[model samples]
Target: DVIMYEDDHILVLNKPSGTAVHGGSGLSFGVIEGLRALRPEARFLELVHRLDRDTSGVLLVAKKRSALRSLHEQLREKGMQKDYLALVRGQWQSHVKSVQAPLLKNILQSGERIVRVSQEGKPSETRFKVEERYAFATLVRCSPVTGRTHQIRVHTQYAGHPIAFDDRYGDREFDRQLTEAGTGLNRLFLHAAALKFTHPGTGEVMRIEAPMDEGLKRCLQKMRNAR
Candidate 1:
């Protein structure tokens, strides 16, 4: 993991794909524990937010308890902003930028959690902007106006274009076809690209960004070449 920005009170890291932010669901090593091991002297390293294990990109951590509380206030007030990048399984047309779908989160008998669009669920909103269009996929920038469990994923699925390599709500037949065609993605095509917030200690606006991971980049390139 790369430390994109760091100070005495806060730390921003480029979390790698396939790594959990905090370990609890059948994983032992996580970003939090790994960072703690790397910096044994740091007393108060806490995760400001969470990202899915398969999603890569910028993550925030607080170095002080005061910083944590301040950031939490921002989160509650909707002052914190997060942006993500995703590759969906189809050519997305224009004028479909905003997705307002209510999401209901549920756990299965096997202890697996899933999210779906339901009238009884919490309100969720996501704005998507097309970045690049491939023959069979499209890269888009996603901004979640309301944070909910798997908000982006469920919204994208509800729009009929699920994120590539998203096994939960994705089309397995399409994925297998892509694999057979030799342009398959290895992981979920979702990434936290940018974050904006006000610094608690310095009282300055902080904007941080993380580049797309190598796997997503390579897959995108392959799609272009195949097209």
Candidate 2:
């Protein structure tokens, strides 16, 4: 755990991929559960936000419910700003663009839900720009104006440039081609790179950043050298 910043009111961690913030039905052992064992009597270590299991980046936890509530309200009101970095497949037609697609979560009978672009859904917007362009891949910075489930992934995919290794909304054949050439990963390549917002209680602004994990960093370096 990379502790970015912490206070008596909050704990900020640069979470690695594959660790859940808290335990659910099938996951009884995750970061939060481990924290419980480490601080057996600590009552305030409550999760104030979440990141996808395979997505790595800044995670915030609050020591008090008041802090959690405050942050939640701010997030609900679009007061928080988040920036994400992704290794996407192929060169985008435009270096910078925005996707203004309405998104809806369709719940399947099997208890699975998928987010898709639909006019009947809530308005969602995400701005993306090509940070680096490569023959087979590109690095993109995405800033979402709305905090919706899978917003970035869906928006990028809709823009005809899905993030590398995004099995859910990506072209499998393209992924296979990259894999055969050894330029891809089996995990989702999207990451929560930075977060900024005013402190929920103190009104002081805060910003946190997460660097690329080792594997992704190595992959990028290898690609750069290979080219």
Candidate 3:
């Protein structure tokens, strides 16, 4: 319900969880489709980047092809920076500032993908900092160096403390405890907190930040309240 940033060349929305960025692969409707329905008169609207179906936060949309290319170029050249906030199981080690574990993707016959840290995997690096320490979990600030699918999720999993409610690489027992921990949060706790990039149309750097969803905010509060 909020537009984080907008102009003649771009549109950034606070993407909600469970909304796919685009319609494909068995899903019939997605964010792009919904946006198109909202603005039927707009001539150009394209996704500049993507977020997981269960991830919520800063989403970029280019209003023009020139802006799309420029935004993509920034991502390719490491000029854009995206920060994600993830609540992971257990206390994150203070000494671990970064994870350089390469990852490989496994495609299942069921058409699902599973990512794992492997010796034969592609280069992947994620910088992390402990934001707050919970009694049984840790809030982590994550920034990925490479734009690999599920990079943050996999890297956190490799660190031995996957993000809470992560269906793929999470510890089921840990998830159960959280469900019973009075947080009442049953969704993925990973969020795209902020984004920074140079504006393609104006050449000015744009910085955008998104607030945590209500569910997440309440969950953290309950955790702190109980602790």
Question: Candidate 3 — which residues are off by over 4 angstroms?
Answer: 109-111
Candidate with top lDDT is 3
The whole-model lDDT of each prediction reads: 0.86, 0.79, 0.89
Residue-wise C-alpha lDDT for candidate 3, range 29-91, written one tens digit per residue: 789989999899998999988898899999999999899999999999978789999999998
Candidate 2 Cα errors over 4 Å, as ranges: 27-29, 107-112
TM-score of each: 0.92, 0.88, 0.95
Model 3: lDDT of residue 59: 96
TM-score result, candidate 3: 0.95
How many clashes in each candidate? 0, 0, 0
Off by over 4 Å in 1: 25-27, 108-111
Clashing pairs in 2: none
Q: Report the C-alpha lDDT of model 2 over 1-227, residue by residue, as the tens digit.
A: 47778887788888888776666555266777777787798877877777766778888888888888888887888888888998877877684589899999876664334799999989998988788777688889898888887888898898888977776787887677667766546677888898997887788998989887877776677567545
Q: Model 2 residue 207 lDDT?
A: 90
Residue pairs in candidate 3 whose N, alpha carbon or C atoms collide under 3 angstroms? none
Q: Candidate 2: TM-score?
A: 0.88
